Amino acid sequence: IIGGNEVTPHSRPYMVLLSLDRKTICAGALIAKDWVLTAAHCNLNKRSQVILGAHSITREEPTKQIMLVKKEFPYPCYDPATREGDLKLLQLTEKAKINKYVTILHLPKKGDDVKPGTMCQVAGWGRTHNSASWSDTLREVNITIIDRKVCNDRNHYNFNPVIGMNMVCAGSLRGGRDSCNGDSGSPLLCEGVFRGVTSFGLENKCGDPRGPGVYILLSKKHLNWIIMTIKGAV
Amino acid sequence: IIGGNEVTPHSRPYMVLLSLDRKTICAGALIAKDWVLTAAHCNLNKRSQVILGAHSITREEPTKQIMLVKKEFPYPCYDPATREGDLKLLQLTEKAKINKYVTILHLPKKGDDVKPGTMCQVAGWGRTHNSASWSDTLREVNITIIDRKVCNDRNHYNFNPVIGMNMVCAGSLRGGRDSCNGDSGSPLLCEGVFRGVTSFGLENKCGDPRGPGVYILLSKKHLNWIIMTIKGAV
């Protein structure tokens, strides 16, 4: 997260810290006791870890719950080329113990787009401005969705890549306010409601005006798949 | 087809006439002896007929090879909301008789994106100008590829629907030359190469400058699905 601030320890109990390996981490959201929603491009291995109730990566916290992935459910229509439908569902081998520091983030009751100018927040352990490595403590920044037509104009992504109707832009026309490397998969909340999944921006150009954050919109389509997968398995 | 002309009987032996029902028809392309490529939104029913070597819908022709669909293969990631990935492979119960009036249209070698200004054409038995009734004879129109960026400008689709990198726009800036209802599924030919499949325009406004024809681009992802589907047997 760039241009944000360190949140109050455990003030965002739905945040999931995904420790992929020693060189990369991602974020996610607990949408069910045994289900985590993250980005499809976030690669997991035997060295990865799904941590709940955390604030600091290193610090040993009693609230943390390190869970295991029973099975990965990437969005079948994911297109790694443009990062379309960049969503992946993590089924946990055991139900997370829901409490005050570990809670569920409910899905959007409807999959409607987000109007430009709406205010949204984004949390994560990704890198910041004055740093190259990830942030040890959770951070969040306030941003605003940019009209997707602007998201595609010459001052921005300029059809490279194209931002479709299942994606939202958000950040700042001036920049400085944005999610970075490590925040991928972080749940995008607008006006207090889960609306998207952090997907991508300009490589190494986090916070740069031309690369406002891009999030997968929890549209009707995506929503129907998510719900179908939670109940489809056992 | 609007703004075109009646082709020479059987001068486009690769064209497939899809008689869906009594109220609707579509077009397609014979990409293999027993394989027809058409649009996913073209609905077929028990009494639908895949007519080959046709020119007239009504008139009786000895070059016609009335076929039947053995199984439909719609694009697994086709989105009916945005007509995204609007494609469908039809497997015929029996292979066709390749002759002078019945040919196989070759698949693109590379899933390139046609450059703006390129000359292309489209044939179909769809409706024409001032003549709301579906043409009885096959027709083709010479069209040009319209820059995707322009295809999304305010003076056009204005990012709604949004035309992605997997879709191309062709027709005319001044309008008048465009594919129409009934021409769905028809193959887009550019420089003599199969480059796309007819998908949509503007409801009852084909030929309108504001809404140039949108064609699914035969990109790599799409071509692979095609080549991967045929080989599959079970």
UniProtKB/Swiss-Prot annotation, chains A, B:
Which residues belong to any copy of the Peptidase S1 domain? 1-231
Reported impact of S184A = Abolished protease activity
Query: InterPro entries from the entry?
Result: Peptidase_S1_PA, Peptidase_S1_PA_chymotrypsin, Peptidase_S1A, Trypsin_dom, TRYPSIN_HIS, TRYPSIN_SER
| UniProtKB keywords | Cytolysis, Disulfide bond, Glycoprotein, Hydrolase, Protease, Secreted, Serine protease, Signal, Zymogen
Citing just one GO molecular function, the answer is: protein homodimerization activity
Q: Which GO terms describe its cellular component?
A: cytoplasm; extracellular space; immunological synapse; nucleus
Q: What is its EC number?
A: 3.4.21.78
Name of this chain's protein: Granzyme A
Species name for this entry?
A: Homo sapiens (Human)
Q: Which gene encodes it?
A: GZMA
